[PDB]
Design a protein around this ligand. Structure first.
Ligand SMILES: [Hg+2]
Ligand SMILES: [Hg+2]
Ligand SMILES: [Hg+2]
Ligand SMILES: [Hg+2]
Lengths: 72, 70, 73
């Protein structure tokens, strides 16, 4: 009947609306992760400071290692 | 378009709504799984608050043991 | 609703669903980008766990050298 055409086109329109809202709601979370990932690209500067401290700590053993060379 | 074409076209869209309902739920699973990869990040981020305490307690210990020596 | 009003609402729902396809197909590209992109980001997280373990291990073992200096200097 025609009331089937009316009832169905209502429900379908409501579900088409729910996709549009949920897609933009999903799309906010995609933009979020994209933006959340950006600062990790600047990790380079921190790893360089880690590289200082990794060598600065080893340099503390300079005199102890000098003794090793003679007495081993 | 006659009344036969509306019954056909109203069903023809209902297929594509069903299709993009599943495609939306596909992309849902892919995102929700990517979000589950933050399990180590929340475990990692909490511990570093406990480990500023220990270094301040270390450095203050260092400052006093140079004061008592000098 | 009239019969011309159904085919208005149906032609209007036809044009938004085809734009909903352009969005879902565009969003899938930015997800597949994040799928590859977040791998090395989450992999670096596992290494920074190691780093914060190792630094705490230094603080502890350095505290032994401090409590040596207390009982020997
Ligand atoms: Hg460096
Ligand atoms: Hg190093
Ligand atoms: Hg500190
Ligand atoms: Hg630490």
């Amino acid at each position: 009947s025609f009331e089937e055409v009316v009832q169905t086109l209502a429900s379908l329109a409501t579900v088409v609306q729910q996709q549009t809202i949920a897609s933009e709601s999903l799309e906010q979370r995609i933009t979020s992760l994209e933006n959340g990932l950006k600062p990790v690209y600047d990790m380079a500067k921190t790893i360089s400071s880690l590289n200082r401290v990794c060598a600065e700590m080893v340099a503390k053993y300079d005199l102890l290692l000098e003794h090793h060379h003679h007495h081993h």
